[PDB]
From a paper:
The homodimeric [name],6-bisphosphatases (PFKFBs) are key regulatory enzymes in the glycolysis. These bifunctional enzymes synthesize and degrade fructose-2,6-bisphosphate (F-2,6-P2), which acts as an allosteric activator for the rate-limiting enzyme and committed step in glycolysis, i.e., 6-phophofructo-1-kinase (PFK-1).
Competition experiments with ATP were used to identify ATP-competitive and non-ATP-competitive binders. This effort lead to the identification and further development of a series of phenylsulfonamido salicylic acids that rendered sub-µM inhibitors of [name]. Significant cross-reactivity is only observed for PFKFB4, although the selectivity window is about 20-fold with IC50 values of 0.19 and 3.6 µM, respectively. The sub-µM potency for [name] was also confirmed using isothermal titration calorimetry as illustrated in Figure S6D and co-crystal structures demonstrated binding in the active site, mimicking several of the interactions made by the endogenous substrate fructose-6-phosphate (F6P). Further characterization of KAN0438241 and its ester KAN0438757, which was designed to increase cell permeability and efficient intracellular hydrolysis to release the active compound, involved examination of their impact on the proximal biomarker F-2,6-P2 in several different cell lines. The effect on intracellular F-2,6-P2 levels is in contrast to what we observed in the in vitro enzymatic assay for [name], where the ester is largely inactive. Given the binding pose, which involves important interactions for the carboxylate, the lack of activity for the ester in a non-cellular setting is not surprising. To further validate KAN0438241 as a useful chemical tool for probing cellular [name] activity, we examined the kinome-wide selectivity profile of KAN0438757 and its active metabolite KAN0438241 with DiscoveRx’s KINOMEscan technology. Both compounds displayed high selectivity (SScore(35) = 0) at 2 µM.
Numbering used by the authors:
A (entry chain A), B (entry chain A): 3 to 22, 33 to 444
């Protein structure tokens, strides 16, 4: 009466007759307030945890409908012609939102635009109602000219809009562009007029928050996430344990210690960390010996996280892939056809891993400088979150032994630099 | 050079020469605002996740220092004598806070009192600084007379203060008592004056929040928790899967299906659920067959949570306790001496379980009516959270087969009612 699904190992009822609530996230705020930053980052998180999510950026539509950008005159409230085009762009983007949530299997749509007037948000609110969408608002408020100017410098002057421009011209144009929105801007007011909307106001670059009427599970998760990200500059280092005894034999999982090359890698990592010369580096390890041994070489304090333990291979723990193929050929084959979803028997899938890692991801967002010493599958999962890689790609990312990945959060994403530390090891990578 | 600790199985450096930042949570708000409710509940959560936490209730000190309560005249601002006693009570409680955090190994102290003036909070702030304590503020704001009156009815009229009183007298006294605080009350203002304090304002019974300057990991976890609890009436039902084939043989873990008695229990549970006649019951199961089979009998929609899977016995999975004793006598003995902390090899401890369950607990707080069909160890862990049971007691709670535990959140805690559904089963309970 119940059968176990062969790939994911879930118990489902046998079916002998197999022959016969989405959300719009609305961005709100003046330009250079980090709205797109938040859009892209939240969407990265949501897709990584498995909630299919898509950004609809009104400006990207405008750049599609109007070939070259001239200047802020385009944004003047008295520009009858431009205003028509901009309104049509928003409506076109909202039509794609509808198509995405109602028809293409998407669960969250992030509507990335200014949305600074009650008029406009009323229209968006009526749109979600008509279509049976929940609406959630994220307003970014920034009253600090230093931050605004830094923002413009960081992401505005080098965007496509300002391709034939120097700094002072682009900066100057952009301040005036901001000006066009200032006059009619009506902040979200949950005290009085917006009493009923589900929203979060992000204040002082994420140090203060107003949150109103969280409706549901996903909204609550979004709020948690948003409240713990920050934009302090930092560096994230990810690597595997130094080579271990099981690596040498091509055995998966288990709890083996460093091979002598692994020990050499640990020393090398110590030297490397020492010369990065970092303020307040947090070091994290799994609870498996190989990662702990590697962290010991650093003579720094480290924390062990059960949640960083390598993927669990269930009955296949401590086997070679060959022993897996000979002993469990049907399991071996299943995994090859669906590597992200496949669960080892009594063990885990990459999908399970992602879920075990949520607390790690959330704490990494809270930290600054961190070094995570972990494992192949685990490292693939973390890297996929940072680099916005898909579930289908995640189990084939290349994370080789003895190599540090240096991640530098930049605006809208992540710079990855690879640094091999010159100690030989086996290769555990396996192509599709 | 590294050795594996025998109980918890953690790798630590061998030590050949073994011969040689706490927080005050400050409650803020008028009486009957739910401050003690929040104190007791947050402290329940924090202790359950392993952060040692203690409530210091100024009123409990006052009732200790002044035998019988007379009336609200005691709380008059012009009562020179009472005010001296009350001030001395706060200071005595703050002295115990200091003793607890600095000397008795406690990590969070919840200072449960009104703390409604800037004067008073300045004094508390200076106290934490002097002692190297972080200070975090929770203010409960309630502007809805209906809620206030309901609160007084619910917890005030039947407290020790009002032992020789009828409702209308106690209610009447209490409104006047509230009055004494109203005049000098200065809410937290993070806009202007409290710009620098770490705080959360809870507004509209937990539907709106102001959050300012979260400093650290634990503060961020407290905020998450506070923002997802609610006081809507609800019922929580917890039970195990119907008896399974492994139960009959005294085997632990594995993924066996219902014995025929288990099937009878499932039907019985269906009948039971049907006659509780509940609005919108959510049903949760583990991903193990026995719980899924039981939920099938209900003909209701259910959700499977990997996180509800029974504790993992590692190498001992699918063994009898006797086979454990004969095959792993040193492991068997270790577990008996330290059942909460002991980790099975390649497996889990109850401590691991608690951590896997955090997302379940958080989602249970968000829900209303829920039925959780799970497993012995898992059920002990959830029950310990709800009933404020210690880590040392948690692995010996009695959660027998075929028996529903009906939990009714009441103010300050949880009513547990047991309901046996009259189907025989083995007993899997094991005394210390
Ligand atoms: O082209 C862009 O870069 C762009 C960026 C944001 C943006 N914001 S919007 O909310 O979608 C929008 C669309 C059309 C008009 C307006 C608008 C703009 C104002 F300045 C004042 C009132 C308004 O209603 C705003 C519109 C745009 O065209
Ligand atoms: O006895 C009680 O039930 C009680 C309950 C709360 C409480 N709040 S308290 O912040 O600790 C406190 C202690 C001493 C004086 C005051 C106080 C009370 C006021 F009405 C006005 C100004 C103040 O400074 C408040 C004091 C109490 O005595
Ligand atoms: N809460 C915030 N307040 C102010 N600036 C922020 C915030 N979060 C991110 N930023 C900054 O915003 C910049 C990105 O700007 P962008 O997202 O293009 O703004 P907008 O979409 O509002 O025009 C980055 O420099 C980033 O550091
Ligand atoms: N955010 C809140 N606002 C108002 N009332 C609440 C809130 N949370 C809990 N309550 C209610 O508060 C009551 C408990 O009162 P209590 O904690 O004794 O108040 P106080 O300690 O402020 O005198 C319960 O009835 C509970 O439902
Ligand atoms: O998903 P894949 O490609 O099998 O790689 C994960 C494997 O890598 C290892 O970390 C090291 O070989 C194993 O412990 C684990 O089973
Ligand atoms: O901690 P204890 O008392 O061994 O009980 C937990 C055991 O109970 C069971 O749920 C049922 O016997 C086992 O699967 C599990 O090992």
């Amino acid at each position: 009466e119940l059968t176990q699904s062969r790939v994911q190992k879930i118990w489902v009822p046998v079916d002998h007759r197999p022959s016969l609530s989405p959300t719009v996230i609305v961005m709100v705020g003046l330009p250079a307030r980090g709205k797109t930053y938040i859009s892209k980052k939240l969407t990265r998180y949501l897709n990584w945890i498995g909630v299919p999510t898509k950004v609809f950026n009104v400006g990207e539509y405008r750049r599609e409908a109007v070939k070259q950008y001239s200047s802020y005159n385009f944004f003047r409230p008295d520009n009858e012609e431009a205003m028509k085009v901009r309104k049509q762009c928003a409506l076109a983007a909202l039509r794609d939102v509808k198509s995405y949530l109602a028809k293409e299997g998407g669960q969250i749509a992030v509507f990335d635009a200014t949305n600074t007037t009650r008029e406009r948000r009323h229209m968006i609110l009526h749109f979600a109602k008509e279509n049976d969408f929940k609406a959630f608002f994220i307003e970014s408020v920034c009253d600090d000219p230093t931050v605004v100017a830094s923002n413009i410098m960081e992401v505005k002057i080098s965007s496509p809009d300002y391709k034939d421009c120097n700094s002072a011209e682009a900066m100057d144009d952009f301040m005036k562009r901001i000006s066009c929105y200032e006059a009619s801007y009506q902040p979200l007011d949950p005290d009085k007029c917006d009493r009923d909307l589900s929203l979060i106001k992000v204040i002082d670059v994420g140090r203060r928050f107003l949150v109103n009427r969280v409706q549901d599970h996903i909204q609550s998760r979004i709020v948690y996430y948003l409240m713990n990200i920050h934009v302090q500059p930092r560096t994230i280092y990810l690597c595997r344990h130094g080579e271990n005894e099981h690596n040498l034999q091509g055995r998966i999982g288990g709890d083996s210690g460093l091979s002598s090359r692994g020990k050499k890698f640990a020393s090398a990592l110590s030297k490397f960390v020492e010369e990065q010369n970092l303020k307040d580096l947090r070091v994290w390890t799994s609870q498996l010996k190989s990662t702990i041994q590697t962290a010991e070489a650093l003579r720094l304090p480290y924390e062990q996280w059960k949640a960083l333990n390598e993927i669990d291979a269930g009955v296949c723990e401590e086997l070679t892939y060959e022993e897996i193929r000979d002993t469990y050929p049907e399991e071996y084959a299943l995994r090859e056809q669906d590597k992200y979803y496949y669960r080892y028997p009594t063990g885990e899938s990459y999908q399970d891993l992602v879920q075990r890692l949520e607390p790690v991801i959330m704490e990494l967002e809270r930290q600054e400088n961190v070094l995570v010493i972990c494992h192949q599958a685990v490292l693939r999962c973390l890297l996929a979150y940072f680099l916005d890689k898909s579930a289908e790609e995640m189990p084939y990312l290349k994370c080789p032994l003895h190599t540090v990945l240096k991640l530098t959060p930049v605006a809208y994403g992540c710079r990855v630099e690879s640094i091999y530390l010159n100690v030989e090891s086996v290769c555990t990578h396996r192509e599709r």
